[PDB]
Ligand code: HEM
């Protein structure tokens with residue numbers, strides 16, 4: 001009746017206030033902090049109002065309306081936003097769709113920074129509130145499409161950090177490690193959702209639902225197809241809706257989707273019991289990260305319904321897409337251990353098949369050997385996971401990274417050295433954070449991490465194109481992306497680098513540097529070395545890295561550093577060059 005008083009109630013003034021603020025700071029990305037706060041209090045006062053007397057004037061007004069009605073209050077709306085001010089001329093449904101166009105995705109405001117730990121804690125102290133709010137403000141404006149609720153989620157964590165680290169003795173040592181963790185974590189989520197939306201516009205809905213059908217019926221094996229369909233569909237609207245920038249519709253539909261999933265809890269998953277006990281703002285979040293339920297076991301076989309049984313083509317023809325979804329749902333709920341995209345791949349295959357068979361004399365004998373073709377597809381990833389994990393075992397994380405370094409560098413030598421370093425050590429942590437798991441949960445794992453890394457990689461090659469091959473990959477569908485890379489061969493075109501003493505000239509600094517440092521300086525040298533002599537047999541290289549490993553101990557453990565490095569250095573450089 002007065003949805004605001006309705007939200008204000010289950011949200012709580014705090015949560016209401018911050019949410020309202022972010023919303024205004026993602027639409028009016030230029031107005032000064034103060035002006036927004038005025039708006040926040042302004043809108044809140046009205047909310048408390050409705051909470052008292054629902055019937056009060058305007059309280060019946062829809063949220064988009066209330067919003068777009070207050071958006072059209074700012075006077076410097078035409079001065080500041082110029083064209084956008086026109087929007088106010090339209091009626092709700094259009095007025096809002098209008099504001100959304102003017103949302104500067106990547107605007108031009110100064111980077112952010114990180115004041116002195118001491119200035120911070122002081123700020124955080126004198127005025128707890130305005131301090132946190134301002135930053136919240138700064139961020140939101142720099143990321144107009146970031147999901148509001150989730151931002152608020154980070155918010156409270158921050159607040160914890162400060163009320164925790166600003167009291168200890170060693171401040172910078174209690175806070176800095178967390179501030180860094182909130183950053184990287186925040187940048188993952190930012191990258192994460194931007195990719196999701198990137199997929200939605202490029203390959204569209206159809207594709208998008210396929211992904212959603214797979215993943216969901218993977219997380220909810222016991223739900224009926226009709227049930228998973230609904231979710232997938234509802235779910236698709238939501239994404240489309242946030243990606244557009246509609247904090248509101250996004251927030252509501254998400255709100256509903258969770259209410260629906262929690263009322264029908266027993267009809268979907270047993271892993272939801274906890275999630276649904278939690279408060280409004282926290283359910284959605286809890287559910288999207290829920291563990292997979294466990295499969296029925298008394299499940300039939302796929303062969304029956306999709307390969308043997310005639311009239312297969314008849315079914316497919318009545319509703320080609322509904323049928324494939326069924327195929328997908330079925331195959332998927334039996335394989336938590338598969339990767340969403342692997343499943344998609346098969347799904348793709350099966351589809352292709354049918355089109356090339358249902359128009360034949362005897363179809364039933366045409367597509368009977370389907371399940372065999374899936375074998376190559378399924379084996380391919382599994383090998384790479386087996387092959388690559390074992391190798392990660394023998395060699396510690398660090399040692400395994402070098403391996404990849406030596407691997408990929410030989411693949412794309414043209415890339416920047418520091419680049420390769422980063423893309424590798426990152427690939428290393430994957431093999432660790434994943435292989436530590438049992439089979440069933442490996443691919444899924446690999447896939448979840450690998451997708452961002454491989455993406456992070458594309459963000460860099462695009463900014464500094466060096467090779468087409470890597471570009472070719474980064475542009476192909478999301479399904480092929482990964483395969484496209486595993487398909488890269490050693491570069492025989494490349495013409496080795498010319499020796500550069502200083503490149504291999506190591507002084508005594510690495511001795512007192514933190515492991516992370518030593519490792520980097522070391523790894524850099526390696527990459528370089530492989531750029532100098534690409535035809536280096538796996539053997540040769542180790543040989544080299546070993547003398548070096550020791551070389552480093554023999555010098556930092558000597559009484560005369562710098563002299564040991566300079567003297568013993570020409571010796572390693574020679575013997576090496578000798579191979
Ligand atoms: C309620 C408070 C806060 C929230 C919700 C928040 C949220 C975020 C998010 C989502 C990002 C990553 C987005 C991106 O760069 O692409 C980020 C980055 C960052 N945040 Fe915060 N933050 C808060 C407070 C602070 C505070 C108090 C500081 C410093 C005193 C800070 C410093 C930074 C820095 C340095 C980055 C990285 C910026 C860059 O990459 O150039 N944040 N934050």
Ligand SMILES: CCCCCCCCCCCCCC(=O)O
Nearest residue numbers: 207209210213321324325347348
């Ligand atoms: C109309 C909504 C239907 C949702 C179910 C998707 C059906 C799967 C068709 C095959 C998807 C191929 C995906 C791809 O190769 O990009």
